[PDB]
Each structure stands twice: as structure tokens, then as C-alpha cells.
């Protein structure tokens, strides 16, 4: 059985975000665009630590290159 209990690491805490069984990046970008009020052309998706390394040094592709698992935690 599959349980969507994915959690997001927010500055306040790591809580269970409102996610479905299937959804794309655009769907998630739209969520944070209303919940946090971020912009789709601003909000960046990251699934790893090294927050300081995200500054320019992180030019990796969040596509099939990094291979995102079904419920990867977003380190924000």
C-alpha cells in the first residue's frame, strides 16, 4: 500500500504538505504560490542539504538527472 505522507522542511518546521498521489512540479509551484505567496519563477525546488552551496554553486538539474523519489523531502 502507498501512503502520501510527504513532509516539507519549512523555516518553522517540517509538516505534511497537501499532496496527492500524482502531481507535477507546476502543481506544487502553484501550491506554494498561494500558501507562501511565492512566484513560480522564483521558488526553487531542492531535495538536498548544503543550503549555502545553493548560492550559484548548485547548478544541478532537478530532472531525471538527480532522480527524485516518490516523496523526497524538500530542504528549505
Amino acid at each position: 500500500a502507498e501512503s502520501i505522507i510527504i513532509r516539507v522542511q519549512s523555516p518553522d518546521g517540517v509538516k505534511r504538505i497537501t499532496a496527492t498521489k500524482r502531481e507535477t512540479a507546476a502543481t506544487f509551484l502553484k501550491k506554494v504560490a498561494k500558501e507562501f505567496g511565492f512566484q513560480n519563477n522564483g521558488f526553487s525546488v531542492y531535495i538536498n542539504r548544503n543550503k549555502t552551496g545553493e548560492i550559484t554553486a548548485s547548478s544541478s538539474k532537478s530532472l531525471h538527472l538527480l532522480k527524485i523519489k516518490h516523496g523526497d523531502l524538500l530542504f528549505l
Partner: protein, 193 residues
Amino acid sequence: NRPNRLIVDEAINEDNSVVSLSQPKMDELQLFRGDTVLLKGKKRREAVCIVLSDDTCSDEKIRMNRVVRNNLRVRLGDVISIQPCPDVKYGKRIHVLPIDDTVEGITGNLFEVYLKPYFLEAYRPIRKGDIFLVRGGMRAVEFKVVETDPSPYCIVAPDTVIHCEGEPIKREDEEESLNEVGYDDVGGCRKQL
């Protein structure tokens, strides 16, 4: 017989905040990639760590480091309970203090040298009373977590200002020193153990 209960064993990873479990077991417990799992040990003490998939892990055993094991008050062949954290929070306050024996001969500021690079961009889970070893800093210094904003545990928030008072703390009797000679202090001799 409760799949969340596994027997603690040794780990191949020297990560102080990471545990290893079998893929089939991870599926049974419904665990993700870098998920934050809560490990309940003995004496009503629990620790939080990240779970990693390991093929060298048994179906009834869980691999973890010596630190977490000792802090869980469990020994080799003991049974612990693992449960993914549904609700976690960032440490809006970090109070850590160096041990008196680890500051012998030194003086000055250890905050900007040790109690910072190990927190900044680290994003690791810690519990009140846990001890971590900083190997990536020339010398291996032992630091004990006095307390945090949320009790009794939380995740290291690099955005939060860490606070380290200028007063070293004494070590407890049940708390061993990471300077002790363990299995990781033995090189070459593998099958000789």
C-alpha cells in the same frame, strides 16, 4: 509482531545521524528517501535520525552507529522501535556546550570555529542530551546538546543563531568519550575481530 520493532546492529556508515534499513523493510514501514525517523530505545529515551536503504541489512535488524545506540540506552542484540516523524519542527534555539575535557589546553572562541560549520547547511536532527563528534574540523571535538527551542528534539536550523555559553560542562558517567578506542579505531584487522 510489530514491524516497527527491529534488532539493533552495527552500521557500515560512520554517520552520527544516519541509520540503515533494508529496502523491503522501508517499504513495510512506508519510508521515503531522506526521511526523519524516530527511534525509541530503552529508559524511555528516543533519538531522531535519517534512514538509508542498505542491502547488507537484515529483515529483523537495523543498522546504526555507536553514538545513537549508546544514547538510546540499547546494546548489540537489543530491540528498538522505529517510526517516521509525521510532525517535526525547526530548532528556533540551539544551546550546545563543549565538554571540559575537550577544551583542555585551548582558549578563545569555538563558536565561530566549531559551533557553526557543523550546523550551517547541515540540516541534521538532534535531541536534548545528545552528543555529537566533530571530525571535520582538524581535531575531533565532542559537543553535547544541552537543549533546543522545541522539546525534546528538533532539526538543526542553520537560519537560527546558535548559542554557546563560555562555560564547559562535565561529562556524565554513563556518557563515554568518543576518544575511546572503538572498532573504527582498528584498521586492516577486519576478520581478526
